[PDB]
Write a protein that binds this ligand. Sequence first.
Ligand SMILES: NC(=O)N1CCN(C(=O)c2ccco2)CC1
Length: 185
Amino acid sequence: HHHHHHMVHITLDRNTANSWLIISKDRRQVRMGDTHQNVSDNKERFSNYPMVLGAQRFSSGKMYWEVDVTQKEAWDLGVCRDSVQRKGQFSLSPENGFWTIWLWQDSYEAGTSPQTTLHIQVPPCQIGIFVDYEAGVVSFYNITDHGSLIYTFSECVFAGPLRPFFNVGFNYSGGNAAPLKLCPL
Ligand SMILES: NC(=O)N1CCN(C(=O)c2ccco2)CC1
């Protein structure tokens, strides 16, 4: 693809993080802690899942960023409405304000309702995410496989400002401790 020139510098918003997440000083990496991270609760924090938002809000234009997923067993990535539900149980779907893909149990799926099987021959170590606000498009690219397309959500109805969305996943197995990292431009 040729979206690299719309690169944006994303940083994580501490205040939105689940209370078990550890965000690096530079706000560019996040991982699951082995306990509560000694923060106060607030209405912004994702309560049920190890999720966090980017600080940046997008309401126009074209935006591109990359995320490192090396050696993780489980994760969710994409964008969401600024006003998504934070508390309790919910599914990742466009009806709920999310445009996401994930890894779970050795398969990759797009967060449609119901979910869509992805066809990935080369397991990605870095994922590229492209958003065209006006066109209503969110696309995912396999940076490890020369930028090959993973999935395109089209005819998106954003219905609000968008925020970068992350889920580091649980670490029940002891094999999913590795961080998500925002990769340099
Ligand atoms: N039933 C709804 O009201 N939906 C919310 C908006 N939708 C989308 O943004 C979308 C993009 C790709 C697939 O769905 C469709 C689902």
